[PDB]
Design a protein around this ligand. Structure first.
Ligand SMILES: OC[C@H]1O[C@@H](O[C@H]2[C@H](O)[C@@H](O)[C@H](O)O[C@@H]2CO)[C@H](O)[C@@H](O)[C@H]1O
Lengths: 132, 135
């Protein structure tokens, strides 16, 4: 599980840039923006491409319980295919950009000022992870 | 070559706006520019003038208000090469514009004009543009 600590937090204008490739037999992977380094920390954002169910799920997690799921359209990911993702923070929410096209806008549910860690988990091959 | 290139933003940009510019610096390039301007008319103020100079091996940053340029800032060396493709992000925050070149933070240009005045992106000079996208 690829971890990037952000002890000074993030603000509008933060860009998480991820490049990689969906393994040919992958089921699902996810990117979490978490509010602490401890296990079970709240998730300001959970971005969950799902190759098995042909879904992309966005959610938040508070005191261990998942919120209301949001879904983007279809699935701009393919097993065996490379991808490019941007998750961009603004004052209003997180903009998920896939393949050089705006994909979904997830409005803030928890305070952005609480985020302290980026975590990329699941079945994915990471070529590059950067926070600008 | 897709230059001169213009992207109108009549409603403006805000913190979290990302300008993504990909292209090739062609073999005999001297310099190119990315401008964030405050209107469509000629001589509009420049909130940001980003000026990679291949011929003098520097990158200049500046602003322009009422026809007058500010004091130039310079990044650390030229992260562009003649004959080489590039990817630039110009990222707006509450504090300024972050310039990212090829997967690394290159320079932070503090706002001199209010971000809320920007209404147009122009790209031109000695570059062969692949794409300009605003997220
Ligand atoms: O919603 C984020 C959270 O989802 C869990 O799976 C969902 C899924 O959409 C479906 O099986 C159904 O709605 O139930 C679950 C929510 O109760 C994942 O297991 C978890 O890791 C997160 O991705």
């Amino acid at each position: 599980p690829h971890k990037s600590s952000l002890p000074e937090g993030i603000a509008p204008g933060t860009v998480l840039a991820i490049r990689g490739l969906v393994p040919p037999n992958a089921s699902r992977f996810h990117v979490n923006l978490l509010c602490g380094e401890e296990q079970g920390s709240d998730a300001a954002l959970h971005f969950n491409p799902r190759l098995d169910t042909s879904e992309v799920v966005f959610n938040s997690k508070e005191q261990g319980s998942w919120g209301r799921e949001e879904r983007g359209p279809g699935v701009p990911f393919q097993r065996g295919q490379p991808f490019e993702v941007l998750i961009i923070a603004s004052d209003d929410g997180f903009k998920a950009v896939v393949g050089d096209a705006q994909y979904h806008h997830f409005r803030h549910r928890l305070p952005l000022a609480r985020v302290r860690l980026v975590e990329v988990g699941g079945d994915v091959q990471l070529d590059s992870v950067r926070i600008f």
